[PDB]
Amino acid sequence: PAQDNSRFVIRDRNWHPKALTPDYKTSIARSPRQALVSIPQSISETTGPNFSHLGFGAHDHDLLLNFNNGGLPIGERIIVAGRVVDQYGKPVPNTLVEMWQANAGGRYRHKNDRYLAPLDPNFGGVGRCLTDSDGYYSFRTIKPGPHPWRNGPNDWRPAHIYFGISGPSIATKLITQLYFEGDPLIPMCPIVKSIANPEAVQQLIAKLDMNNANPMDCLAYRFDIVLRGQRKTHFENC
Amino acid sequence: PAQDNSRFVIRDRNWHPKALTPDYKTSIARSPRQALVSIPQSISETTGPNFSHLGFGAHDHDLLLNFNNGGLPIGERIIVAGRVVDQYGKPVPNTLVEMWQANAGGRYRHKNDRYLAPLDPNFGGVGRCLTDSDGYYSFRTIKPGPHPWRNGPNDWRPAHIYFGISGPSIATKLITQLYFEGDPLIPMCPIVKSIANPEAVQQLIAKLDMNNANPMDCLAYRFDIVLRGQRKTHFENC
Amino acid sequence: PAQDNSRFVIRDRNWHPKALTPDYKTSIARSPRQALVSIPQSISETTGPNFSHLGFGAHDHDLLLNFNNGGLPIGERIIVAGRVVDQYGKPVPNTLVEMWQANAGGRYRHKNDRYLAPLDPNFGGVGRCLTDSDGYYSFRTIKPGPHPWRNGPNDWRPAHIYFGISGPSIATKLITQLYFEGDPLIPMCPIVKSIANPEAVQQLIAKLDMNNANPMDCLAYRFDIVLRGQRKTHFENC
Amino acid sequence: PIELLPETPSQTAGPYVHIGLALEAAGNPTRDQEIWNRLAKPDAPGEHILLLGQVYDGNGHLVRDSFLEVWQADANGEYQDAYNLENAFNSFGRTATTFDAGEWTLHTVKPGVVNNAAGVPMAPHINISLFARGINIHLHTRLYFDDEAQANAKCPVLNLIEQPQRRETLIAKRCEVDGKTAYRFDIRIQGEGETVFFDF
Amino acid sequence: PIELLPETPSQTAGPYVHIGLALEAAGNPTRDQEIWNRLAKPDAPGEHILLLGQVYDGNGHLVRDSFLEVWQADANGEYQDAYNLENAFNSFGRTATTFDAGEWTLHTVKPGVVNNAAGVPMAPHINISLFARGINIHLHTRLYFDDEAQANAKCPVLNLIEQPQRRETLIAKRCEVDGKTAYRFDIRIQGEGETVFFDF
Amino acid sequence: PIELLPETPSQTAGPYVHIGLALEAAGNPTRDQEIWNRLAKPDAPGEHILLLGQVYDGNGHLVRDSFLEVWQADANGEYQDAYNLENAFNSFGRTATTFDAGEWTLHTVKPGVVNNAAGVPMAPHINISLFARGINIHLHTRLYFDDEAQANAKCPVLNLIEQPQRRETLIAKRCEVDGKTAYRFDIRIQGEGETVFFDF
Amino acid sequence: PIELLPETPSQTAGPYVHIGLALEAAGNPTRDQEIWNRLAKPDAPGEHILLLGQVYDGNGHLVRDSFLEVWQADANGEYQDAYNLENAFNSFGRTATTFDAGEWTLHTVKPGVVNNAAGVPMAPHINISLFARGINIHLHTRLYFDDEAQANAKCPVLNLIEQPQRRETLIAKRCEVDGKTAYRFDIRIQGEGETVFFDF
Ligand SMILES: [Cl-]
Ligand SMILES: [Cl-]
């Protein structure tokens, strides 16, 4: 079984978005009004699932082929790749990375999305993979379109892909959203702007990566992820 | 019939791209090596077709509906609108504006395009309209995807839409390409860079126009066009 | 035998010198006038020779002893050392590095060089080695002198040593010239200036490296070489 | 001071989180292996329990698009990190609220006692992370059991909650669902009876 | 000095120009009204002529993806700007080279004489703008007729070409295609026999 | 966008390239092991062939100081990267033009067929890199064989050359030289008959 | 992106709004023509109705200085923009709360049905803008009618309110006042029963 042998750098909750960010309207009723209660890390917080023996399908990381109903999906073919490291710069190998997104037109394959842009019969919108032994992951997909939503009267999400990353413990687990270099919708979005620090926003912007592209085939974007720094215990209980 | 009653400001051929721009490889064999021969403007150059009585179909300016084969095209719904003026700032009313583009995935509906990204059965890629009496035009379409092409070994066009504009004479007629705000492919493209002056490149970049968008429906981009300034003749033949 | 399991970042041919750089006069007649034809990488381009089992003489890397005709050569004793890496920063081990140069007075040991400065009976001007397991190479030599040449009426090469580097494939192979920190000839040389970007020129300038010198014996210069980035293939043929 | 690389900042999981993390709920086909809400095969040791709950916003209305992740010791008080659908027990699982009724369920065993870092026993608990539209960074909580009153009273984690009344928000209620032992654990994100959320 | 708004800069029409401007050639359906290569209904006055040509690059190879626009006076030397597919004559038309043979065609009438701005007659001519992949800004030229030698000799536009040999590049050759009067007008963009291109 | 470390920029190999890379030719003593123009020992399997050629500049004059590196498959269409002067065959070699007649020679076997990355067979070819004074970055080309005309017509690399006429520049001409099979491959850097050069 | 001229920013109407907009209430003489709370003369077609209401703050106390503007369709569901005190009916009016009891009143007809931009019928409603000291930008709401329950249940505007409970805040209660049909519409700016406010 798992052991308590490490500690995780405390989160900066002014770097992360705060709970209450009223321009993102749904956060008003869904943010606690009491302060979070700080507790010391124990084996409960410092361990978590390892997914080495989860059985992945052949196309689980390839959205151009994992919803195949007779053709290729329509849209901009891209590889999304990067590295998962901790705050000390250590790679995070064999970690679960999951991603989901709308299609090229900003339509999600979810019963609750009624946006008038059509579904793509050959696009599902979900992928998963493990980072390799050096902490790298990669997916192939189509670039998602912006999605309008009922926040303000003319609010549109920038093109974005959701990411969930397990990391080595439940204390490191994170869901975030990737945005794309240059998207003029990024400065305007109340969800992006739930993050107060402009330098933190920049950390969510994937960069065009011509070096990783397949010529005559697909472009590529690079999105690196940093999880809480992990260190050994020292001088505890003495 | 038409009359010679106006003169057009001479083109700045260092503002326009030069003929020979060798990083765009096809320009090497298709650029003259002799200097252009300057001639004075006559009725031949200072008149041109007016298309007021060209009969346009109901959807000729609407690419979401003008290639309808049972559904909507997949991709980012956008309005592309703007004003056509001359260099003096005068609007250019009732002028022909034609546009064409690839689909959301960068695939053109042309027999010669064999790029592996699929065609969209409900997307054709051509539109036309006349500017209104104040010089405004508008189209509805999907945002085109980048297109790889056999120039250098890893060359990709930014998302672009071709435009042709008649204006008041054959001397004003222009074909150009519209690019989209923030596209990180723009600085890298040898066709964009056939234009030497960075300020001229900026003139081809359409800006996100939230003010003209339809909420829960489509975004909008604004692309204004400036044609050669038109003035009356003065002090000629005396 | 060799396999096709890697791809090499496409060359930036505006970072490299262009073929046609007329101030370097011989380039006028020895530059293509048609554009290069881009072809995709295959095993023909992504493989190349490995010289691990080429047999080196004891003094192959040591130009102070490899043309011994009774004494040491005259001139500034120096070590030239550095690392060969690729664009991702990865060391390039067991790669062939060859170098050749004029003597202390700018005279080459070649039948065709008739510059009036004398040959040195104990200097030949050629070295070779393999990089070590960590990508490092090392030569010992004499600092070459400037060499006048029949380009313009008073043109003089800065002090320079030619380098040839094989790397992992014929796609990475490179010949270049090393120049020396602070040499006032460097900005005036039409061969240096075949490279249009000043930052690129700076990448050819070896830096005085006192840390690597042998006191009371020889100085040292450091010259790191960057070859094209190598990556694995991904998502090809699917 | 020493400044490390900043952590990637969190964002909401959004209303369509189920596309990626709860495929059935999205209305979509599942893959061969999914991480879901059954932590125990029937033959796993320990007391088999049904867990269930609803999630309320600050206006007392159901949060119908919640996504929950849970992490718990096996019956012997050991965390099992080697996730495998062949295992009799996994310490990790996922669940989500129905869009209709707003109820999530988990099938598990009651966790054994585990010690904190100072060697003091914590009361049996399940660690919970809650994600949804409108939640910018996930909320951490713990589910404890109302039939562990003696242990709960002595838990060094519960005892860090300054007001005793707030401790009650983390105690799940034992009941029976179809003759089988169950606990209800409702979460109130905001307002009257607001659930304690942790930082660590 | 006085600086006006800069003109929008030109870009190549590209290899797929026919999608937008020559729908048939792209392999696509046409709309009800298209601007194309028939400037004259059969009953229009003047001498009915077939025009045709090929376009060569600097290596002497065919430019198979050329797009051409033409503007010419009617037989009476008047420019007709009111474009209408009901008209017996339009002064404007479009054509394109076949991808196979590389030949464009126009169906028109021989234009009448028009005076320049100083009142001097120009020889009969058709104004041509040439667009294609690899052409960054369109090339302007004129097609004159080899059976107008006397007028051509006196044309104040031709006479602005400094070298007489270059004038010959703008003179179309009279022939017969199927018993009907035709003129061939080839364009050489670059090199030996390079066609004169104008700026105005 | 992502910017990697920039590659070290190329410079010309210069007129005295031979002293470093073609020691015999410089007029100088050779070392015990040199990389030179004999890729195949008499015992290597495959058809033993002589290759020879001259290099011309844009004025039609011999480039008497060229240096060439070559890379080819063995007779089985396999690339042999383990370079060793003890090998019956090496896939790599070097040659240079004589200052007197300006001819280079190579002693090799005809390469077997290799597929491109898409699995389509390439016609038999030798990869060539050409260096010299006046060449700021080496020119890449390929030598194909005129006795492989049917394979050459289907080569997906030759087919990337848009104009069929230019493909001819890459086809070496078979002849007999002292009773052995030979091919001449002349390179024209610039002008009429300019050899195709590649970027990859 | 495209940035237009910025709109002039709002400021509170202040506690003395009445001197500019509700002259009677300020304690001041009125002009010959005032825009006030009688939208319908006795002769206007439709069901004549009295509307009345009070406004509460977040502490449950009356807002005794509120100013309200209203906009509604006539009995045919048509908006009448040509404001004239000679009209039997005007679509626009103003009212204010008494400083003493804090009640506003309006004299009008029940509006007819109007469709949204998509052609779907809206339940009968009055559009309201609320101004006062402490309100930095006016609050928009709508008054619907409790005797239109079946129409209200299908209103595509009421249906944009995610929680059915909040829709109830917009439904005025029918009563009789001195033998005439009346509806009470109370507004709670903040807290329990907070009235829905719109942005458009
Ligand atoms: Cl579908
Ligand atoms: Cl189709």
Ligand SMILES: [Fe+3]
């Ligand atoms: Fe989203």
Ligand SMILES: [Fe+3]
């Ligand atoms: Fe294009």
Ligand SMILES: [Fe+3]
């Ligand atoms: Fe030199």
Ligand SMILES: [Fe+3]
């Ligand atoms: Fe005031």
